[PDB]
Amino acid sequence: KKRTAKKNITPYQRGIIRSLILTLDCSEAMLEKDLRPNRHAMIIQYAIDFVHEFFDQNPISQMGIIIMRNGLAQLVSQVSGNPQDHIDALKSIRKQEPKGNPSLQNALEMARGLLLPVPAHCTREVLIVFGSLSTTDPGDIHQTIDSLVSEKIRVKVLGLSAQVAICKELCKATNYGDESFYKILLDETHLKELFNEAVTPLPVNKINKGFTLVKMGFPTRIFEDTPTFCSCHSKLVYGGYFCPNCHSKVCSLPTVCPCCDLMLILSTHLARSYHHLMPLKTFAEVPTTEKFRSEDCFSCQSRFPXXXXXXXXXXXXXSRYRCEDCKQEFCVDCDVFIHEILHNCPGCESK
């Protein structure tokens, strides 16, 4: 009995270039009380946490939000890479209470058009917050699902504590036949991990496709204060960035310059992808009988790691979760952080 990653995520390809559009749902089903405040108020906040983390782990992507009220699919934020605008729309959604029922087919019709401006390199994905037990299809919903699979638009849905075949078929059909995106939620923590697992890339089997060699730029900082200006918003910007090509001022952000249309990234977009592409092997709990390490931690100083000859305390476990290749022991609290935010293994690096 041990609950960790099985062997290792084989580092070959993961989806960093993406445009995931989550489709929320504000329906009278969400007026039914399942969560602590209600279905509607709670899910928004965990999507609010999802948005920042989604930008945190996939900063070269864009985000869009879709709501479903009164049997109609309604977008509140276009597919874009703006974290603050997405939250601002969700606040008004949070300010209001749900009514009606969700409309699956309209959202699927919305999803196809919405990700059409999404670039080829960005991996297509639409996230469905489907919680109710019925849809509203003004046509053949099997036709649009056939369009998304043919046009290579993978769909992962985040269902509530209910199981529907159409959503399961939708997940199976779009994701290259793979049926592994139908995890559902039953708790406050349970629904967040579905969002958190959507924050990370979702590889199952990458096919051989025509890969695109695309051109993107790196901006440069500014320092003027009294000459405060920017060519992106045309406001009193007391600090911003500049494209090396167009010389058109932009605020301090990864905002794409509106003059020559080349992608702008500072340091995070390349770096946040690098730790995603090649994950290390999980530091599994080294056996206490097979520890052969000193009574402390290695990455940090956690002297606690052995009860030693204390009945049901001794023969228990040990704070000695060691990395595989680096062969360095580490406490479970420490070794978890070793694979939580930054891999940065000490024994692996200290060589």
Q: Can you tell me the distance from the alpha carbon of 211 to that of 221, in angstroms, rounded to the nearest whole number?
A: 32
User: What residue is closest to Zn ion based on CB?
Assistant: 334
Give one word for 47, left, alpha or beta, with left for phi > 0 and alpha for psi -120 to 50. alpha
Which whole-number Å values give the CA distances from 152 to 64, 81, 300, in the listed order? Answer: 18, 22, 46
Binding mask 281-320 for another protein (x = CB under 8 A): -------------xxxx-xxxxx-----------------
Q: Can you tell me the distance from the alpha carbon of 347 to that of 237, in angstroms, rounded to the nearest whole number?
A: 46
Asked if residue 325 lies in contact with residue 349, where contact means CB atoms within 8 angstroms, the answer is: no
In sequence order, the 6+-apart residues with CB closer than 8 A to the CB of 340 are: none
Q: Can you tell me the distance from the alpha carbon of 106 to that of 74, in angstroms, rounded to the nearest whole number?
A: 9
Q: Which does 81 bind (CB under 5 to 8 A by kind): another protein, Zn ion, none?
A: none
Does position 163 interact with another protein (CB under 8 A)? The reply is yes
Does position 237 interact with Zn ion (CB under 5 A)? The reply is yes
By CB under 8 A, what part of segment 86-145 binds another protein? 121
Does position 220 interact with Zn ion (CB under 5 A)? The reply is no
Which whole-number Å values give the CA distances from 334 to 118, 197, 210, 273, in the listed order? Answer: 40, 22, 42, 23
Does position 337 interact with another protein (CB under 8 A)? The reply is yes
Binding mask 216-255 for another protein (x = CB under 8 A): xxxxxx-------------------x--xx----------
Which residues sit at the interface with Zn ion, rule CB under 5 A?
Answer: 230, 232-233, 237, 243, 245-246, 251, 257, 259-260, 297, 299-300, 302, 323, 326, 330-331, 334, 345, 347-348
Which residues sit at the interface with another protein, rule CB under 8 A?
Answer: 13-17, 121, 159, 161-163, 182-184, 186, 210-221, 241, 244-245, 262, 266-268, 270-275, 277-278, 294-297, 299-303, 331, 333-334, 337-338, 341-351
